[PDB]
Structures are given as structure tokens and as C-alpha cells.
Amino acid sequence: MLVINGTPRKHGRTRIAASYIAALYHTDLIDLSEFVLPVFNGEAEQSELLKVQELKQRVTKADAIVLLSPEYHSGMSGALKNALDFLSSEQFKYKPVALLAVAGGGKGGINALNNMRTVMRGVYANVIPKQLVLDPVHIDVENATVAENIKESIKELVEELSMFAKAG
Amino acid sequence: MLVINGTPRKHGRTRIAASYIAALYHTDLIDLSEFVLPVFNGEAEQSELLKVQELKQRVTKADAIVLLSPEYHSGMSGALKNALDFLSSEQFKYKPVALLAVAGGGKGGINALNNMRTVMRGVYANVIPKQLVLDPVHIDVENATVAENIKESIKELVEELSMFAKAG
Numbered sequence: 539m540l541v542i543n544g545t546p547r548k549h550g551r552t553r554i555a556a557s558y559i560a561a562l563y564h565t566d567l568i569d570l571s572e573f574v575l576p577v578f579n580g581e582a583e584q585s586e587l588l589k590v591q592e593l594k595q596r597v598t599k600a601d602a603i604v605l606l607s608p609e610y611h612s613g614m615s616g617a618l619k620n621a622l623d624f625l626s627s628e629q630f631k632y633k634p635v636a637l638l639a640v641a642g643g644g645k646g647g648i649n650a651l652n653n654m655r656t657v658m659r660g661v662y663a664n665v666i667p668k669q670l671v672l673d674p675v676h677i678d679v680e681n682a683t684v685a686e687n688i689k690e691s692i693k694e695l696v697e698e699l700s701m702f703a704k705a706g
Numbered sequence: 707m708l709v710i711n712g713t714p715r716k717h718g719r720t721r722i723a724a725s726y727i728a729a730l731y732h733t734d735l736i737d738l739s740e741f742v743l744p745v746f747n748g749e750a751e752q753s754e755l756l757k758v759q760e761l762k763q764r765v766t767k768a769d770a771i772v773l774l775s776p777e778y779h780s781g782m783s784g785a786l787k788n789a790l791d792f793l794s795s796e797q798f799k800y801k802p803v804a805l806l807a808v809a810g811g812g813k814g815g816i817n818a819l820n821n822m823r824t825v826m827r828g829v830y831a832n833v834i835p836k837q838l839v840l841d842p843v844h845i846d847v848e849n850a851t852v853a854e855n856i857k858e859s860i861k862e863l864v865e866e867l868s869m870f871a872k873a874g
């Protein structure tokens with residue numbers, strides 16, 4: 539199982555959620571805060587840089603992926619989209635994915651999720667129905683860990699994810 | 707009037723459309739293929755780099771903006787979103803915008819437009835109803851210019867744009 543962090547900020551609330559999941563479930567983690575690539579420009583050499591082929595590998599290797607991204611202007615992080623512009627259906631096709639967005643509370647989050655969904659569906663991925671949104675109240679920035687009150691949600695999300703993974 | 711190119715590829719079909727409009731209408735053009743910034747990471751120093759404050763300026767200065775982006779995985783270019791993650795409502799609030807996406811033909815384009823719309827609405831911008839999609843058939847890659855068959859469309863798009871610009 540793979541976990542991708544969307545927040546390009548080394549000190550982001552989304553980064554915490556990523557670490558939690560990837561850790562507590564022992565999964566391959568790709569923190570976009572440190573794992574940084576160049577802004578896609580569509581050029582052969584680029585599609586063969588350093589981190590680029592590693593990204594394509596780790597993604598096309600995981601059975602199921604847990605995609606996390608913060609809501610930036612009612613959409614996923616420009617960082618996460620840029621990294622996705624390097625990949626394609628060749629690494630996501632029919633691959634089980636579980637969307638999870640981190641917003642600043644309120645009604646935020648839904649637009650981010652739908653964005654990630656529409657894009658994932660475009661690369662023929664398989665987004666599971668169950669989706670989650672983490673507000674600041676769900677993140678304990680104090681001890682860089684998710685608040686207990688949400689651990690239950692996250693559980694069944696990943697749990698439902700694996701369910702789809704085994705099915706097909 | 708401002709024109710923003712979404713395609714981060716110096717040799718992209720979207721780049722052509724951008725040049726056409728910006729030229730034929732004598733507007734401020736920002737080609738994201740050359741005007742490149744670092745992948746947003748949310749840090750003061752960054753919010754005061756080189757191109758960053760220029761972007762904030764040119765955008766907050768234009769009366770109406772013509773936003774162009776290619777469809778990448780049923781969404782706007784990860785590059786355009788990254789650049790938008792630097793800006794905010796402070797430079798778009800109530801500012802008239804006209805969305806225009808460039809896809810590889812077929813039914814593509816709509817998902818990209820809706821993306822740019824939802825994001826634009828997020829920064830309180832003012833997206834005009836009229837929106838356009840340019841397929842390869844509308845782009846003459848041979849002489850790096852838009853095909854005559856579409857010049858009519860583009861006309862009234864920009865024309866309707868300015869209409870909203872003067873109203874409020």
C-alpha cells in the first residue's frame with residue numbers, strides 16, 4: 539500500500555495525516571514536501587530524471603494508494619497535480635485509490651476531493667466511494683499527530699480501501 | 707487585459723492560443739512555459755522571490771484576465787494550479803475572468819474548464835458564463851497560429867469578457 543502526501547509544505551497539517559497513516563499501517567510513503575520534482579514541461583529527458591522514474595515505480599508497484607492533499611483554492615495542491623502530470627493511466631489503470639483531503643475546517647474539502655476524483659478517474663484509476671475530509675479539529679499540530687476523534691474514520695477508510703484491493 | 711498560458715511546455719498547443727489572443731488584442735501576456743516559479747511550499751521568503759511578486763502585480767493590475775490551460779488528466783495543468791497557489795482572493799476578488807481550455811479533441815476540455823471555474827470561484831473571482839474549448843482541429847501547429855474556423859468563437863469570448871469588465 540502506498541501513501542502520497544499532497545502538501546508541499548514541510549510543516550503542513552496534511553503531512554501529519556500522511557505520516558500517521560503510512561506509519562500506523564506500515565505502508566510506502568512519498569512525502570511531496572521533500573520528494574520534490576521539477577515543474578512538468580513535457581520533455582523526454584525530464585521523463586527520465588531522478589525522482590521521476592522512482593515515482594512511476596513506487597506508484598505502479600503499490601496495490602492500493604492513499605492519496606492525500608490539502609485544499610488550495612477549492613482544489614488539490616498544485617504540487618500534487620504537477621506530480622500527477624508526470625504519471626498516467628499506465629501506473630494507475632484499475633488501481634484502487636482512496637481520496638482524503640485536509641481543509642481549514644468549515645465546508646472546505648469537498649471541492650478538493652471531487653478534483654482528485656475527477657483526475658483519478660481520468661487516469662482510469664479506481665476511486666472507492668468512501669472518502670474523508672480532515673479539518674484542523676482532526677489534527678493535533680501540538681504533537682504532530684491526528685486527533686483521536688478521527689482515528690475511527692481513517693480506519694475504515696483504509697479498511698474499505700484494502701477490501702477493494704483484494705476483490706480485483 | 708491579462709492573458710495567462712497554462713501549458714508548461716514551450717512547444718504546446720495552448721501556448722499558441724495564448725500568443726494569438728494576447729497579440730491580436732494587445733494584452734499583457736504571461737507565458738508559464740518561460741515564466742517559471744518554484745513549486746509552492748508555503749514560506750515567507752518564497753512569497754517574496756523574483757517572479758512571485760511580479761505575478762501578484764500583473765494579475766492584481768489587469769481589469770479582466772483570460773485564463774488558458776491544457777487539459778491534463780481531466781483537470782488544469784499542474785503548473786497553472788501551482789502558480790495559482792501563490793496568489794489568492796487579494797488579486798482576483800470580483801475580477802472578471804474567462805476560462806478557455808485546450809484539449810486533444812473528443813469530449814475532453816469540460817472537466818478542465820470546470821476545474822478552473824471551481825478554483826476561480828474559490829478566490830472570489832468572476833467567471834463569465836461563456837467558456838471555450840480548443841481541440842487540435844482549432845490549432846494550426848504548422849504555422850503556430852489558431853485555425854480560422856475558431857477565430858469567431860474567441861472573438862465573442864474576449865468580447866463578452868470586456869463587457870463584464872466595464873459593467874462593474
Ligand SMILES: Cc1cc2nc3c(=O)[nH]c(=O)nc-3n(C[C@H](O)[C@H](O)[C@H](O)COP(=O)(O)O)c2cc1C
Pocket residue numbers: 545546547549550551552553608609610611612613640641642643644645646647674748791792793794828
Ligand atoms: C494559498 C492557500 C489557499 C487555501 N485555500 C483554502 C480553501 O479554499 N478552503 C479551505 O477550506 N482551506 C484553504 N486553505 C487552508 C488549508 O486547507 C489548511 O491549511 C489545511 O490545514 C492544509 O494545510 P497544509 O497545506 O499546510 O497541509 C488554504 C491555504 C493556503 C496556504
Ligand SMILES: Cc1cc2nc3c(=O)[nH]c(=O)nc-3n(C[C@H](O)[C@H](O)[C@H](O)COP(=O)(O)O)c2cc1C
Pocket residue numbers: 580622623624625626660713714715717718719720721776777778779780808809810811812813814815842
Ligand atoms: C500528462 C498529460 C495528460 C493528458 N490528459 C489528457 C486527458 O485526460 N484528456 C484529453 O483530452 N487530453 C489529454 N492530454 C492532451 C492535451 O490535452 C493536448 O495535448 C492539448 O492539445 C494541450 O496540449 P499542450 O499541453 O501541449 O498545450 C494530456 C497531455 C499530457 C501531457
